[PDB]
Amino acid sequence: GAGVLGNAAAADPGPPTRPAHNAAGVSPEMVQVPAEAQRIVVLSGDQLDALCALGLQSRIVAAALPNSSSSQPSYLGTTVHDLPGVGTRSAPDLRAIAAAHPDLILGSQGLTPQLYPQLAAIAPTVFTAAPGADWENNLRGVGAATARIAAVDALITGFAEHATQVGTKHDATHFQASIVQLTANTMRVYGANNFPASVLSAVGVDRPPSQRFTDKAYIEIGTTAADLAKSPDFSAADADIVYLSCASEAAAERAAVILDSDPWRKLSANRDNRVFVVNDQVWQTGEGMVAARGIVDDLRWVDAP
Numbered sequence: 321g322a323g324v325l326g327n328a329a330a331a332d333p334g335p336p337t338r339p340a341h342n343a344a345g346v347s348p349e350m351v352q353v354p355a356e357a358q359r360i361v362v363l364s365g366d367q368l369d370a371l372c373a374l375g376l377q378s379r380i381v382a383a384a385l386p387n388s389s390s391s392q393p394s395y396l397g398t399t400v401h402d403l404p405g406v407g408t409r410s411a412p413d414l415r416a417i418a419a420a421h422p423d424l425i426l427g428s429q430g431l432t433p434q435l436y437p438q439l440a441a442i443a444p445t446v447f448t449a450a451p452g453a454d455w456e457n458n459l460r461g462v463g464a465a466t467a468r469i470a471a472v473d474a475l476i477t478g479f480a481e482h483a484t485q486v487g488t489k490h491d492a493t494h495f496q497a498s499i500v501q502l503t504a505n506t507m508r509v510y511g512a513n514n515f516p517a518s519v520l521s522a523v524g525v526d527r528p529p530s531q532r533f534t535d536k537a538y539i540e541i542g543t544t545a546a547d548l549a550k551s552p553d554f555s556a557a558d559a560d561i562v563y564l565s566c567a568s569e570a571a572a573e574r575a576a577v578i579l580d581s582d583p584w585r586k587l588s589a590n591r592d593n594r595v596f597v598v599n600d601q602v603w604q605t606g607e608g609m610v611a612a613r614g615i616v617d618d619l620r621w622v623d624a625p
Contacts, residue, residue: 336356451515482616483523495623497559498563603618
């Protein structure tokens with residue numbers, strides 16, 4: 321009974337190559353990149369999102385797949401969905417990366433730090449920080465890596481204004497929103513330090529007191545049959561509105577079990593029909609500007625009847 325919601329930039333003036341910064345802890349920290357990279361290999365989901373927000377998706381030649389997955393993300397359109405794979409984000413395939421003969425490689429120090437020297441020997445390589453709450457800084461690093469700092473500045477400025485405008489029109493500050501993600505065996509309740517939390521903050525939506533922690537991304541509650549038969553407490557998940565995504569198909573197949581469970585039916589948001597199923601790629605795994613706009617779109621339901 322839970323409603324389902326789901327959810328080319330011109331280069332800066334300069335020479336044909338530019339210096340760009342790697343994330344802190346990458347050696348070396350500076351890398352010379354082309355001003356107009358024609359064949360980009362992207363190894364992290366947030367950078368793929370960034371290239372789409374910059375209108376550069378037709379220059380991507382391959383992308384690392386989400387781990388345990390067998391396909392590219394679909395929330396970014398068919399051109400990205402059809403991209404060849406180069407292994408997964410946690411284990412990129414260097415032979416396939418070399419086979420794409422890229423002139424630019426984007427990756428993340430939070431995913432494959434050990435791989436940077438081998439990647440840099442194939443093509444100019446830029447590593448951003450780990451994806452998550454700092455997505456806007458990661459976007460800024462993609463902007464420098466593609467010589468599109470001005471373009472990224474406008475995307476960030478336009479997003480902040482757009483998010484604030486949506487929050488004002490829909491009275492976001494008067495609602496506490498909960499962020500929940502189901503896995504096959506557990507329920508994850510996200511706090512205030514992660515990708516979707518930072519987008520809810522940009523819109524101005526409040527969070528329930530149980531979801532304001534910042535020491536970790538989420539807390540995890542068991543949801544197996546043995547767990548449910550031990551009278552668990554899901555009250556950390558309650559709010560005025562609950563946004564719930566499923567981390568996998570097996571999680572989706574068990575979602576209705578948890579939503580029908582006695583511990584979940586105790587939640588006031590469930591009684592009030594204010595639990596909404598949302599796209600996990602938009603809310604959890606994309607972690608970029610296009611995903612962020614999808615979350616803002618879903619947040620338009622905070623003041624719905």
